[PDB]
Ligand binder design. Structure first.
Ligand code: V14
Ligand code: ZN
Length: 257
């Protein structure tokens, strides 16, 4: 099965998922000098006041916080997007060391982690149909750098010991994702893909320019998760990021400058 190791990591995924070598794969390096300011882009509309978090889950590759997406409670609109995208979940990718962990890079810089808020286009009715479409998902990506703590992240960090191993979940109600956002909503955007199998090319990526600051202790706690299930040898969950992929025939657009 796929994963992040020597024998089943990103460089092997193409054998099961040939789209790994496709024309719109993610993540990518964001060359800030060659990204084009697009005056016709709109401000993002991030409408998260009615978000209903449900559950946090160790998938065996990362952890994710899941929301009620059975109605338009928390939605993403505007920016490069046509229509209404419903928040389904968020998750992170992170490293074994503070200078790696992000999927996107900025002028080749890697951050300690990257937060992904996954949304699906409500014109397709359910998320499983939306993944079959070139404009089915919108993922909002936010970089994490190590510095001062992020208070809005601490509820997430504190529950991780209850979901140490693959397949564990825990109630995670009443969490407000607005606490994970930086001050600015300046962004880059480009068409891309899931960054894990099945690597489907169904994502409009919106990557915020401003990272959030998390403490060394918050990220250390991410690295205490396990890829393995309970009752199996411990494999620390670190380095669950895909490296930058070829940009090919794509332009990254900037909402700013
Ligand atoms: N980085 S990412 O946002 O492209 C991404 C993941 F890294 C990721 F691991 C997941 S996953 O845990 O579900 C593993 C399977 O790819 C999703 N989740 C979305 C993509 C999965 C298909 C259904 C669409 C909505 C969830 C996912 F979108
Ligand atoms: Zn992701």
């Amino acid at each position: 099965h796929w994963g992040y190791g020597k024998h089943n990591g990103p460089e092997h995924w193409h054998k099961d998922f040939p789209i790994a070598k496709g024309e719109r794969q993610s993540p990518v390096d964001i060359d800030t000098h060659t990204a084009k300011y697009d005056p016709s882009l709109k401000p993002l509309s991030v409408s998260y006041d009615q978000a209903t978090s449900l559950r946090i889950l160790n998938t065996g590759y990362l952890f994710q916080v899941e929301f009620d997406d059975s109605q338009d409670k928390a939605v993403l609109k505007g920016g490069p997007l046509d229509g209404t995208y419903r928040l389904k979940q968020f998750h992170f990718h992170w490293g074994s060391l503070d200078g790696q962990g992000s999927e996107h890079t900025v002028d080749k810089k890697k951050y300690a982690a990257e937060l992904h808020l996954v949304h699906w286009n409500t014109k397709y009715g359910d998320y499983g149909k939306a993944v079959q479409q070139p404009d089915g998902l919108a993922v909002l990506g936010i970089f994490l750098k190590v510095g001062s703590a992020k208070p809005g992240l601490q509820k997430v960090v504190d529950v991780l010991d209850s979901i140490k191993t693959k397949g564990k979940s825990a109630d995670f109600t009443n969490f407000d994702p607005r606490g994970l956002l930086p001050e600015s909503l300046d962004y880059w955007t480009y068409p891309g893909s899931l960054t894990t199998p099945p690597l489907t090319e169904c994502v409009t990526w919106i990557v915020l320019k401003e990272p959030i600051s998390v403490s060394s202790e918050q990220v250390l706690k991410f690295r205490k998760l396990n890829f393995n299930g309970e009752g199996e040898p411990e494999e620390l969950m670190v380095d669950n990021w895909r490296p930058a992929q070829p940009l090919k025939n794509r332009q990254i657009k900037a909402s700013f400058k």
